[PDB]
Structure 1
Amino acid sequence: PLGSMTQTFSSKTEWRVRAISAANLHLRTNHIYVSSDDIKETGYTYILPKNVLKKFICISDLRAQIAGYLYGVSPPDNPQVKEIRCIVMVPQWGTHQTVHLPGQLPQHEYLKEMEPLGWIHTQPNESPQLSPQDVTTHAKIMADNPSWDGEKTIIITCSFTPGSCTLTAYKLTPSGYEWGRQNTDKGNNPKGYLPSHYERVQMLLSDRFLGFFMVPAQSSWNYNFMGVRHDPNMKYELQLANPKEFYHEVHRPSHFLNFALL
């Protein structure tokens, strides 16, 4: 009836479409918005410098989440304000739902006189609620690291809203910290997850000061093409340098060596 062998399949890798899409991320850095109305006034006010935030958007991907650790201090006379001074990129991989950081926290001389303020991460879709997995990730970090106090550390989400980027920031609750430790359900709606597990914090973008980045000494930060070489127990040290974009050549050496291989 039908003559088969009619048409031949042609491989169309999906990472190419995202690589082309990642090259236009710089346009979103001119229109970055912060969730405003809040409930307000109270906690610490976290001030994020624009230069590292724009760089954090440029090195990311539209669907695979990336994360960086927050470090900073307070102004000399104003303890209720937290200026974010450094973002640390560590070996990581992620999905559309979460990221996978190692167990070890950043440890370096430059950061020892700064206090950790939490972590910032991207996500594809703007959401009204903090991710239940973000609550689990933040709580499991607090359980293993007493330097992360629940009243001092936050979770900044950089949502990809069409032609823009929206920043909302949350902190954990004692109820949220307690449930996040026990949670072994990665599903998008586990049992026990409630809106009572977090609150919003006030966040301000500033041009008055500049932050800086810290990246792995050897290595790099993006392991989304080398997930085998990523392990939760992996160790790493840092250097004072700016990070490479997501699809930089050093993050996907197999694409360059397997193409050259005959």
Structure 2
Amino acid sequence: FSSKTEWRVRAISAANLHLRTNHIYVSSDDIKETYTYILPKNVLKKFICISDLRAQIAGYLYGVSPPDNPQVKEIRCIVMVPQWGTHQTVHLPGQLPQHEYLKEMEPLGWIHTQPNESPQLSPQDVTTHAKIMADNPSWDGEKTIIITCSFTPGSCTLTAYKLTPSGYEWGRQNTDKGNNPKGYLPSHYERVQMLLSDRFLGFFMVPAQSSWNYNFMGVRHDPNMKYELQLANPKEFYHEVHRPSHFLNFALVYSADREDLYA
């Protein structure tokens, strides 16, 4: 990127993210109906507000099943990991978020944002989901899904899809991270039924040592890096602790010395 004047335009686009959270829509097509992802509205609005128009955000969804209802999976935790996001994929680290509040909950997959409305499943996101399913034994392919938040103009379109086992085997053996790699099939992911939940409120998991937005300090973000978790609220993308190089860069009295004013 240029990183000279486009950052101010990206901040001005991300400052109006509160108006984009009021128009929430889901793609009601290609549903197999063979668990249902019940996302809370507060965590979805917090993930849409802390995201960017161009920089892609990423968050792991953890939650438990409701009593006497195995066909629904309500999300209750949005774990944020320190990672950077490009215009097509996110460079998520290989270390899984470990916390005490997420021990009783199961990982229902992952969520990510996209700047363009994709009518089909993304190959890089499906490859990242297959790599996360192969690198973690607790991330089963039948329960873990991928949520894509397409940045609609003035809105946000959420589409959840579960990866096929043949699609997971194709993505685990894939090595090209381009726009159209080899073995890209439309049957590799099936759009699962997803709903919203207004009667329940979930939580979020934030890192304790560092921040979650590594778009500015991308050199300090490694795939084999380790980080702790906390049960607090996650910070914004353009926070003071997310870009330490932009704050601590300045160098270290003969004006009108108006002392003892009305303060």
Smaller-chain TM-score range? Answer: over 0.9
Distance in 1 (alpha carbons) for counterparts of 2:251 and 2:126: 44
Distance in 1 (alpha carbons) for counterparts of 2:2 and 2:116: 31
User: Which has the higher mean CA deviation after the structures are superposed, 129-138 or 242-251?
Assistant: 242-251
Please name the residue that 1:242 is paired with. 233
Partner of 1:103, secondary structure, is coil
Please name the residue that 2:259 is paired with. none
Please name the residue that 2:173 is paired with. 182
What are the superposed Cα offsets for residues 120-178 of structure 1, whole Å, 9 maximum, x if unpaired? 01010111111100111000111111111111000001111100010001110011010
Q: How far 1:10 moved relative to its partner?
A: 13
Unaligned runs of 5+ in 2: 253-263
What are the superposed Cα offsets for residues 161-219 of structure 1, whole Å, 9 maximum, x if unpaired? 10001000111001101011111101111111111211000000110100111011211
Give me the TM-score of the superposition, normalised by structure 1.
Answer: 0.93
Distance in 2 (alpha carbons) for counterparts of 1:22 and 1:249: 15
Q: How far 1:253 moved relative to its partner?
A: 2.2
Distance in 2 (alpha carbons) for counterparts of 1:131 and 1:53: 21
Distance in 1 (alpha carbons) for counterparts of 2:248 and 2:133: 41
Partner of 2:250, secondary structure, is helix
Change (3 A) 1:168 1:11: closer
Distance in 1 (alpha carbons) for counterparts of 2:44 and 2:200: 12
Partner of 1:109, secondary structure, is coil
Q: How far 1:256 moved relative to its partner?
A: 2.2
Q: How far 1:250 moved relative to its partner?
A: 1.4
Partner of 1:243, secondary structure, is coil
Distance in 2 (alpha carbons) for counterparts of 1:33 and 1:75: 24
* Aligned-residue CA RMSD (Å): 1.9
Distance in 1 (alpha carbons) for counterparts of 2:4 and 2:182: 39
Q: How far 1:11 moved relative to its partner?
A: 9.7
Change (3 A) 1:260 1:59: farther
2:217–2:245 Cα contact (<8 Å) kept: no
Q: How far 1:28 moved relative to its partner?
A: 0.6
User: Which has the higher mean CA deviation after the structures are superposed, 165-174 or 11-20?
Assistant: 11-20
Distance in 2 (alpha carbons) for counterparts of 1:185 and 1:37: 29
Partner of 1:33, secondary structure, is strand
User: Whose helix proportion is higher, 1 or 2?
Assistant: 1
Q: How far 1:32 moved relative to its partner?
A: 0.7
Count of residues in Structure 1 that have an aligned counterpart in Structure 2: 252
Distance in 1 (alpha carbons) for counterparts of 2:79 and 2:99: 10
Distance in 2 (alpha carbons) for counterparts of 1:234 and 1:196: 33
Distance in 1 (alpha carbons) for counterparts of 2:93 and 2:3: 34
Change (3 A) 1:110 1:15: same
Q: How far 1:13 moved relative to its partner?
A: 2.1
Q: How far 1:25 moved relative to its partner?
A: 0.6
Partner of 2:19, secondary structure, is helix
User: Which has the higher mean CA deviation after the structures are superposed, 33-42 or 200-209?
Assistant: 33-42
Q: How far 1:251 moved relative to its partner?
A: 1.2
Distance in 2 (alpha carbons) for counterparts of 1:60 and 1:11: 18
User: Which has the higher mean CA deviation after the structures are superposed, 31-40 or 155-164?
Assistant: 31-40
Distance in 1 (alpha carbons) for counterparts of 2:3 and 2:224: 36
Change (3 A) 1:41 1:66: same
Q: How far 1:12 moved relative to its partner?
A: 4.7
Change (3 A) 1:10 1:222: closer
Unaligned runs of 5+ in 1: 1-8
Distance in 1 (alpha carbons) for counterparts of 2:248 and 2:136: 40
Distance in 1 (alpha carbons) for counterparts of 2:51 and 2:2: 28
Q: How far 1:260 moved relative to its partner?
A: 4.9
Change (3 A) 1:167 1:11: closer
